Amino acid sequence: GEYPTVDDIPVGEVRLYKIGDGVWSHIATQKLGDTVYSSNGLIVRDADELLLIDTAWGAKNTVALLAEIEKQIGLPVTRSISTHFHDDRVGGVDVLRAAGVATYTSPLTRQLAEAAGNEVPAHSLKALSSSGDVVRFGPVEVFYPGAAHSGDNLVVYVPAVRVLFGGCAVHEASRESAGNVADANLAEWPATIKRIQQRYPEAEVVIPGHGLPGGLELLQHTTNVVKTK
Ligand SMILES: [Zn+2]
Ligand SMILES: [Zn+2]
Numbered sequence: 001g002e003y004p005t006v007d008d009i010p011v012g013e014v015r016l017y018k019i020g021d022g023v024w025s026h027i028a029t030q031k032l033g034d035t036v037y038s039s040n041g042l043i044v045r046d047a048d049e050l051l052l053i054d055t056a057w058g059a060k061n062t063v064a065l066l067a068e069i070e071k072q073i074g075l076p077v078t079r080s081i082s083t084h085f086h087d088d089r090v091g092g093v094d095v096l097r098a099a100g101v102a103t104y105t106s107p108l109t110r111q112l113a114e115a116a117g118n119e120v121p122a123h124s125l126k127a128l129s130s131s132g133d134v135v136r137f138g139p140v141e142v143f144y145p146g147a148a149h150s151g152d153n154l155v156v157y158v159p160a161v162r163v164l165f166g167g168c169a170v171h172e173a174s175r176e177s178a179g180n181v182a183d184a185n186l187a188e189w190p191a192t193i194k195r196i197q198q199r200y201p202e203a204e205v206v207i208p209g210h211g212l213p214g215g216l217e218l219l220q221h222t223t224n225v226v227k228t229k
Contacts, residue, residue: 003027003212006036014056014064016043016072020161022139024073025207026065028056030088039088039210042165043069043077044158046139052080052101053140053156053165055092062092066099077101081142082121083167084153085112086183088209093119104137106144108152112183128154132195143199145169146192147185149209153192157200164203166196171222172211178225189226193219 002008004015004027011031016024022045029038041054050073056065069077080096082089082105090113093103103121105113106128113120127135131146141157148169156165169192171178178184197219206218 004038005212006038009038012060012064014061014068016068019205019207019213020158020163022046023158023161023163025165025213026054026056026068028058028061028065030057030061037210040165040207040213041089042156042158042163042207043073044139045073045075048075049078050075051138051140052077052096054083054089054167055080055096057088058091059095062095065092066095079104079138080121081105081125081137081140081154081156082109082113083156083165083209084150085109085116085118086150086168087118088168090119090121093121097122106152106154109154112150112152131192134199143196145195145199146188148189148192150183151185155196155200157203162202162204164196164200164206166206166208166218166222168209169193169196169222170206170208170218171225172208173214173218173221175211176225177228186226186229190223193223193226 024043026041044051056062104123105121107124128144153169
């Protein structure tokens, strides 16, 4: 049906949304002040297991995520990748570890998470240290396009179905400001977007870290938003 939003996900709950064959997004919320915010991750089937991209933004939500996955898909999450060091990506890693998931991210993300006092995935993805680096991981590619929203942000591509999870380096269409730039590299963000555009020219779906999925237009949209400043 319609992509889940803060206006229709019951409080405390996590939703899944089917994106294509063997690929779902997960959507969770975290109210701060008067505004309820949502956050997206990904789930990708591989053989008879699941690969998780990002936590559901905190321990409580991540427990609910695992329960929703069991209810709706019924296959075990065996590995996860966090796409940068913020709480919407690693908050809940200890829940994943308790559930027997092998948790991964880049070495830089582990370092930044440790410095921030955030939860830290247990394992490093090697050969992701330089912009342009890419590695295969089961049914996905993991690409480090360079600094943008954060110094460490990764994107994840599902080649079989042309789905790009852009994460927080990519803004949703309705967003016209960059939001939280405390860890951002605004100078490098446009070049980082260009690397993503050049690497994944056939992507059919682009999923931002927050908000509605779109297509490749979200990439240039993000650059446009960055240019404001
Ligand atoms: Zn972030
Ligand atoms: Zn984010």
